[PDB]
């Protein structure tokens with residue numbers, strides 16, 4: 001069972017774990033055979049081990065992530081808009097993706113797809 | 126192939142046709158075999174006929190559609206956040222979905238899914 005509020009709670013927990021750099025808190029939100037496709041059009045990482053290495057490498061740089069709009073949640077699915085900022089040696093970068101989570105009966109995320117492209121990667125001078 | 130610029134333009138075309146009541150301008154965006162699942166979870170309308178029939182009814186009440194954020198486009202896929210305002214019995218309603226379009230090689234829309242739930246429906250006048 002996945003009510004709109006549980007799915008929203010998971011998204012917030014997710015954003016908070018990213019900010020915290022809590023690698024195990026992120027992975028604990030995924031099902032054992034869950035898939036991650038980040039960004040869309042890339043070979044999908046399947047399972048806990050692959051999911052974990054993916055985030056371990058992403059967390060190499062401290063992230064600052066923010067939800068920019070209400071979470072859309074319906075029928076075991078949720079989609080949200082957010083921003084991920086991080087500096088890279090004087091270079092501040094802001095990525096603006098839209099993620100899509102698919103949940104399972106247990107309330108764990110079974111699929112994650114992060115949709116962003118060159119046009120969503122911003123970052124200054 | 127599908128460039129970000131194209132996919133983004135299709136979305137902007139879509140929102141315009143929708144604002145104008147331009148049914149055929151919308152049906153033209155899809156492929157002969159395209160599918161629509163609006164909302165996510167409901168039975169998906171397949172093919173131009175079913176898609177036409179679906180949009181013909183949705184348009185019964187003149188819509189005021191607006192893009193609330195930048196389009197996310199990458200690898201034959203695009204997702205965008207927006208609002209659909211209208212009235213029905215003196216009451217104003219604002220639906221805030223996040224759409225997901227998948228394009229074919231020809232640049233046409235083969236799949237569309239609308240993700241919004243009770244939480245994204247506001248009487249916000």
Ligand SMILES: C[C@]12CCc3c(ccc4cc(O)ccc34)[C@@H]1CCC2=O
Nearest residue numbers: 018038058063084095097099114116
């Ligand atoms: C990988 C990344 C850091 C994390 C991250 C990115 C893009 C989309 C994401 C979506 C997520 O749900 C979680 C993390 C990211 C950035 C792409 C460029 C970069 O440095």
Ligand SMILES: C[C@]12CCc3c(ccc4cc(O)ccc34)[C@@H]1CCC2=O
Nearest residue numbers: 163183184188209211220222224239
């Ligand atoms: C169906 C609808 C009119 C059209 C519409 C809605 C919601 C999401 C949409 C997403 C689209 O991409 C195109 C049209 C709609 C409204 C839900 C309530 C309503 O009257």
